[PDB]
Structure formats: structure tokens, C-alpha cells
Amino acid sequence: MTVTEPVGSYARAERPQDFEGFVWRLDNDGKEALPRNFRTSADALRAPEKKFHLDAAYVPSREGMDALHISGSSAFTPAQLKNVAAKLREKTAGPIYDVDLRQESHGYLDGIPVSWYGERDWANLGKSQHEALADERHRLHAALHKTVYIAPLGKHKLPEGGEVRRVQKVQTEQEVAEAAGMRYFRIAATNHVWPTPENIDRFLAFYRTLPQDAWLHFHCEAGVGRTTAFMVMTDMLKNPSVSLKDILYRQHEIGGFYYGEFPIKTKDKDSWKTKYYREKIVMIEQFYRYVQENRADGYQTPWSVWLKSHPAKA
DSSP, X not given: OOOSSOTTOGGGGSOGGGSOEEEEEESXXXXXXXXXXXXXXXXXXXXXXXXXXXOXXXXXXXXXGGGTXXXXXXXXXXXXXXXXXXHHHTTOSSOEEEEEEEOSXXXXXXXXXXXXXXXXXXXXXXXXXXXXXXXXXXXXXXHTXXXXXXXXXXXXXXXXXXXXXXXXXXXXXXXXXXXXXXXXXXXXXXXXXXXXXXXXXXXXXXXXXSOTTOEEXXXXXXXXXXXXXXXXXXXXXXXXXXOHHHHHHHHHHTTSOOOSOXXXXXXXXXXXXXXXXXXXXHHHHHHHHHHHHHTTTTOSSOHHHHHHHSOOOO
């Protein structure tokens, strides 16, 4: 009769009540000067990771990379963001945006970057961005002058060690970004899965009206999955004549994930990730198709509407 959840919306079938947040997770221990997986579109391409079984001899086209003006990284401490801002300012004189792609509630407690972690990092699964942000503001404010437990995850993604402290200061990422001289833009994307149609519609609208010399610094928790997906989408939108192969290879060779087909291998405990990786591969190709078919008329129809009439196939 009718499909309940179409390709690209698999996560909608999961139950949010089974992944509610339970601890303040430490996002970065702040020992390094910069966040992890820091990379920009001006960087040199390096050898591909063996896990993706790609052609190391292949030389991807760099067409349009000099004007792409994007970067990516993991989460960061306030000091690390300032170092990022300073490095990016040496590359551009345009506005620098901190594009926060995290749906999970996060912020800073006494300057320490933390996020309200639920199993699979799905504590805000199913919430609208409005609802997620409200949860985030409420949780951060409720921590002020209260005792909290902050810990890094260890064996089996469960707390291990950490610290206990009575919070004297709370800040949102928006505040920390503005303190580093960056503009802020939030897209609440769920970790480990393809961004929702509303996530992408929001990004495309924001992208279309950006200043010509705008620089976009994308980031998620670790700086791999969600960050690379949006870097790839921006590359496709700005350089539509570049082949899909070149886009996927170059975004991976500067330090990101490889969004093409490859032998997916997961440990038994991570078997739930397998189908979401397969979905991402199919959706990447579908987004490329959307751009090729709708750029000519200036995107009169958005991704969400187009996708409903042109469903992806597994």
C-alpha cells in the first residue's frame, strides 16, 4: 500500500524514549591547541585511508577548491575555537561562521565543553530544532550553581572517571562563537544518520543568501560524519560541474569521511550503524541528483518537496 518511512528517514522508526540523555559527556579535554580533525578546503590532498579501498594513484580534480572557503573539525573548548578563528582569519577577510551541526544538547560548564549524552548520542532524537534548543537552554541554566558530574566515555560508551564540580558559569555555543569573532548558525542534525529533509532545507536557504566571501566552519562532536556530509553538500552546490567521484575523493583526502561505496565493517556491538551507513551512501547520490536537476531554475522547489516526489531507492 504505502511506505511508512522512505529511504533517508530510517531513523524516524526508532523510539526516542529508548535513548534519553543520562550524563554530561566531556566533548574535549582541551589538551591540544586545536580541535581534532581540523581541515580546510585550502589543504593539500593526502593518501586515502585503506579502510575505504580507494585508488591511491587517482589524482582528484581541485577545480573550485580555492574559492570553496570551508573547514571542519570536532567539538572544542573556548580557547581552541579562538585558535581556529585566528587560523581562518589568515585565509579570508569575509565573515566566518561557526556552523553547529549538533542536535544533541551541548554547551559549556565553567568553560568545559559538554553535551547531554543518551545512548547512541540520540538524546534529542525526534525533537524539532525548536524543541531541542529549548531543552538545551533549560538544561544549561539548571546546572548553574548546582553539582554536576562530567565524564569522558570509556568501555562500551559508558562513563569512566571524570570529575564532579559545582558550576559557577554556563554558556551556550553561540556565546562562545561570538566571543571568538565568529557568526553562529545551528542545524540540529542527529548523530550517525543522514540529515533530515528539514535539516537540509534549512541549510540550503541559509547557504543561498550568504555573503559572497563567507567562510563556513562546520563541526559536530568528532568532526567526521555530519561535518563531512555538509562539507560535501556545500562542495556540490558551489561546484556543480565537478564529478561526484572528485567531490567524494577530495573531501575525504583532506581529512574527512569517504561518502562513496566501500566495504562497511562494524563490530558486533556496532551492528546497528550498518544500515545507516548504507542509507548515507544512497542519499549522497540523491542530493547530487537534486542539485543537477534544480540548480538551473534557481531551486524553485526545495529538497524536502523534491525528495517526496523523487524517492531514493535502497
